[PDB]
Amino acid sequence: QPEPDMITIFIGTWNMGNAPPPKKITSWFLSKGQGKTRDDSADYIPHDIYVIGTQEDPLSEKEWLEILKHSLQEITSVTFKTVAIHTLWNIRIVVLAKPEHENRISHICTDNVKTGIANTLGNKGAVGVSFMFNGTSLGFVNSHLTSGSEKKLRRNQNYMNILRFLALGDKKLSPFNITHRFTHLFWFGDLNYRVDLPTWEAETIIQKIKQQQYADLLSHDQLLTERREQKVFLHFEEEEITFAPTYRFERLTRDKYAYTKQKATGMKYNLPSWCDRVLWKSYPLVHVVCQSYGSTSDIMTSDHSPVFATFEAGVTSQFVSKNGPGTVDSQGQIEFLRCYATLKTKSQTKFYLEFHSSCLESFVKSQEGENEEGSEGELVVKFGETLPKLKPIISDPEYLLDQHILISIKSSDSDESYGEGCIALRLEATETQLPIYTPLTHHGELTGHFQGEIKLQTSQ
Numbered sequence: 271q272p273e274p275d276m277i278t279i280f281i282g283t284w285n286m287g288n289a290p291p292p293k294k295i296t297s298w299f300l301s302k303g304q305g306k307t308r309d310d311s312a313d314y315i316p317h318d319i320y321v322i323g324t325q326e327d328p329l330s331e332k333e334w335l336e337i338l339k340h341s342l343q344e345i346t347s348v349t350f351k352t353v354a355i356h357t358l359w360n361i362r363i364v365v366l367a368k369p370e371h372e373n374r375i376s377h378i379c380t381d382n383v384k385t386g387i388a389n390t391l392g393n394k395g396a397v398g399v400s401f402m403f404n405g406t407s408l409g410f411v412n413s414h415l416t417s418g419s420e421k422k423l424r425r426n427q428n429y430m431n432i433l434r435f436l437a438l439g440d441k442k443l444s445p446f447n448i449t450h451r452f453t454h455l456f457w458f459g460d461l462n463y464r465v466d467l468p469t470w471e472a473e474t475i476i477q478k479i480k481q482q483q484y485a486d487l488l489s490h491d492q493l494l495t496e497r498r499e500q501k502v503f504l505h506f507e508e509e510e511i512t513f514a515p516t517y518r519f520e521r522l523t524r525d526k527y528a529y530t531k532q533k534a535t536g537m538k539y540n541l542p543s544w545c546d547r548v549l550w551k552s553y554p555l556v557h558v559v560c561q562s563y564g565s566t567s568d569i570m571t572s573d574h575s576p577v578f579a580t581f582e583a584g585v586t587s588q589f590v591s592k593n594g595p596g597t598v599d600s601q602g603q604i605e606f607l608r609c610y611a612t613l614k615t616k617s618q619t620k621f622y623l624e625f626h627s628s629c630l631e632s633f634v635k636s637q638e639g640e641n642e643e644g645s646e647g648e649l650v651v652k653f654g655e656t657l658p659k660l661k662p663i664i665s666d667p668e669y670l671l672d673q674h675i676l677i678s679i680k681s682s683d684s685d686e687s688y689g690e691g692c693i694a695l696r697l698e699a700t701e702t703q704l705p706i707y708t709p710l711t712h713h714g715e716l717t718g719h720f721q722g723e724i725k726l727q728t729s730q
């Protein structure tokens with residue numbers, strides 16, 4: 271039985287509005303409704319992994335797991351296995367996988383982050399799951415961010431707290447947050463960003479929706495505008511939205527948006543918005559293709575509609591040679607040439623790098639770089655040809671060209687990372703000096719850049 275080089279992943283997000291679901295929710299897992307929908311001819315083909323995020327979920331874990339498993343069995347005739355389930359308050363993530371993947375899945379982690387302080391601590395936050403699928407690390411975050419049209423900045427803060435504090439993936443990657451720990455990271459949920467148009471324009475917005483004219487609404491979607499201004503979700507992707515706003519509906523129909531201010535809303539308007547979203551971030555030059563992104567039309571127990579997204583995702587096999595794992599493949603090397611970091615910091619410490627990769631036995635610390643001043647104010651840290659030659663565990667190009675090197679630039683004074691990034695080894699050539707580049711982030715914000723040249727030697 272061959273190991274796969276692709277899998278498909280279903281991501282669902284649904285704010286259930288504290289109501290039990292209806293008896294049939296199969297349209298969700300089939301990617302049927304509005305938007306970028308899945309072809310009917312695929313209906314019986316199971317996804318490899320289903321990741322279900324709920325918010326305002328009133329069910330027990332057992333109750334929801336039974337509904338999910340029965341749904342998938344009805345669609346696919348496959349009895350899915352539970353990889354992980356994690357709940358914080360009424361925010362939940364379930365990961366289900368095909369039974370044939372049971373020995374391909376390992377290192378399963380779960381965590382949660384509670385957002386805000388005192389007043390604001392008590393129902394918002396995130397849950398997450400990570401695991402390895404053969405040689406590929408996968409992370410999944412379901413967040414329910416702060417509500418309210420005038421709280422986009424608080425949502426952005428909630429995002430940064432979640433990506434700082436959610437403890438998933440390989441704890442040895444200590445300088446790296448979740449935005450660098452995974453081959454593929456999916457972040458979804460009731461992100462609660464709104465269409466920022468005047469209250470008076472509510473009926474105009476409804477008209478636009480009825481005409482399926484989303485362009486003048488999406489141009490005011492706070493998540494898109496905040497992302498464009500690099501305020502949130504830097505270096506994440508989202509498929510184009512081609513479905514109607516998924517909030518806020520009258521229950522038991524989808525014919526009416528309930529937007530007007532009510533005691534129950536704290537006298538807030540809920541103009542129709544795309545609260546419910548799926549975003550992703552994959553390491554450079556890894557295959558990831560969104561094959562659906564939409565909302566259901568027939569699940570109406572909540573004031574939100576379910577959102578689905580599906581992805582093709584490249585995966586690699588758990589490589590064994592005669593040499594690695596448990597020794598180097600002396601036929602392999604990675605040389606970082608003429609490298610420099612450009613940092614936005616005002617500090618004057620010396621910096622060193624750490625190179626982290628599952629192709630190394632353990633992370634590698636460089637010598638300190640040479641600080642210079644850039645022409646427009648910047649700190650430039652030069653490493654020259656001083657960087658340590660990296661010795662991968664396996665030299666086979668079919669393995670090595672699929673790997674990635676995470677880079678942290680750390681202060682000598684504090685050992686704190688000032689910037690993190692990632693370099694693909696999917697090069698155009700081996701034994702050839704080639705340009706490399708990554709932006710550097712810290713706490714998911716841009717802090718600088720790393721650029722230079724690489725020379726990769728494989729056994730070919």
Ligand SMILES: COc1ccc(C(=O)C2CCNCC2)cc1
Nearest residue numbers: 356357358359360381382384392
């Ligand atoms: C300290 O305050 C807490 C602690 C736990 C919760 C939960 O909901 C747990 C989280 C993990 N899995 C079961 C449920 C909420 C607030």
Ligand SMILES: COc1ccc(C(=O)C2CCNCC2)cc1
Nearest residue numbers: 351352353367368369371372375
């Ligand atoms: C097919 O879905 C799967 C795949 C893998 C697992 C596991 O590896 C379990 C997880 C808990 N600790 C180790 C065993 C479970 C379900």
Ligand SMILES: COc1ccc(C(=O)C2CCNCC2)cc1
Nearest residue numbers: 493494495497498505506507508
């Ligand atoms: C039209 O509004 C936008 C435009 C761009 C963004 C982005 O952040 C990325 C940039 C890099 N990859 C693709 C899109 C978000 C909203």
